[PDB]
Amino acid sequence: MYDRHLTIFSPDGNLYQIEYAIKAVKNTNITSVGVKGENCAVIISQKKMATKLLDYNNITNIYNITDEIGCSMVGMPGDCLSMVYKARSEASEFLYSNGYNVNAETLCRNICDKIQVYTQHAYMRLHACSGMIIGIDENNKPELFKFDPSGFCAGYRACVIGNKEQESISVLERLLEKRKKKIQQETIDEDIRNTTILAIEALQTILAFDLKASEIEVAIVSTKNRNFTQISEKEIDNYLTYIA
């Protein structure tokens, strides 16, 4: 047929090895949702085996590319770690070749550019991964960028990657509606308490889980912090009780 290779178009004009690679991400049952508010943007992991005695403090889905640009690569457990190094060795290659620190949009457009060259050539296979590059730029405006195994530097105000993307758009839409229409002009950079609750409420609405204390680890990249700090366990369990 026309699916055994990657560099061949189907008779209806549609690439299938790329399409099968996106199905690999929607098969590892790992869902990571991230939201972006005003000068505050967070990302939530899920901390589950990509499929006893395992140290559950090490298994994660959040890796930092630089000190101020973090991400969360989900998908195959062997392709996500390689895409972090193809980004860690890219953003570190930017600061040496350009002096100033790299932006979140330049990093995602450079990762999607490297992914595209493997699509035209039949040399390697597609990296079955999908990450949400988060971070803030020089203009103090946070961003977010999700990239699938194809080329996509789309960028969202709130996105969810994983095996639930087929219908998890309405839940993130209703939760952003409850904050935009209920905007509070008395914002004193307390969004780390407001936007983080909006994110944990999103993942708890998608997945009906009661006590997601030790299986949820988030990260905040808001201003006055600027370091992609992974929030501790005590603050996570404290945030989980504000839903009452």
Partner: protein, 224 residues
């Protein structure tokens, strides 16, 4: 690898043309005081933004470009289009002419068709802009050839949209008159009535730099 067919054509190239006939529709029209290029920014939801997903891009101060195929192939042919618009601006003084830019990008798309191990480019460009000899609006077919079009469309349903232009475009049409016929041909084929700030239009605007029309500017033309 693309190979010849017994009937005398390319099979893999013909499948690339079937890809541009199933994407977001584009529209390029050349007027007497500049050129215009339109698209159809099909909003999937309210999660993506408008500052990143672009169907209109720039190459130099007077070069516009739109796509009609793979979204992932946006940032790769644009990266080499800017470098060839810069390399020409280094070895030579002024900017790059549209005929010298299209004859360079076409040599890149054609090279990715004959060389083994590669896949043909799944997109159809529309390079437009101001040239010292007037105004041009080219189109890069995925096979590698090009046409010196005057008014065309390349995306989905490029057959009925092409007939809607032959009966609505004279030789002498101003920019403000061409904008009204641009949105008219989009709505005559686009599904639904949600045409509201979902079209990104570029304009040459009679020997001036390329200015992408904002959201508060396209509503001024859409109401007419």
């Amino acid at each position: 690898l693309t190979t010849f067919s017994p009937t005398g054509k390319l099979v893999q190239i013909e499948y690339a043309l079937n890809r541009v006939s199933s994407s977001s529709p584009a529209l390029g029209i050349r007027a007497k005081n500049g050129v215009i290029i339109a698209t159809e920014k099909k909003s999937p939801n309210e999660l993506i933004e408008e500052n990143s997903i672009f169907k209109i891009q720039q190459i130099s101060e007077h070069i516009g470009i739109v796509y009609a195929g793979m979204p992932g192939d946006f940032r790769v042919l644009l990266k080499r289009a800017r470098k060839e618009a810069i390399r020409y601006s280094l070895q030579y003084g002024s900017e790059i002419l549209v005929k010298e830019l299209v004859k360079i990008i076409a040599s890149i798309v054609q090279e990715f068709t004959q060389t083994g191990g590669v896949r043909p480019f799944g997109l159809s460009l529309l390079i437009c802009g101001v040239d010292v000899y007037g105004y041009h609006l080219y189109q890069i077919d995925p096979s590698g050839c090009y046409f010196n079009w005057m008014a065309t469309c390349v995306g989905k349903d490029y057959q009925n949209n092409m007939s809607f232009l032959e009966k609505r475009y004279n030789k002498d049409i101003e920019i403000e008159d061409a904008i009204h016929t641009a949105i008219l041909t989009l709505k005559e084929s686009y599904e639904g009535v949600l045409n509201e700030k979902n079209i990104e239009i570029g304009v040459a605007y009679d020997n001036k730099p390329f200015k992408i029309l904002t959201q508060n500017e396209i509503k001024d033309y859409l109401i007419e």
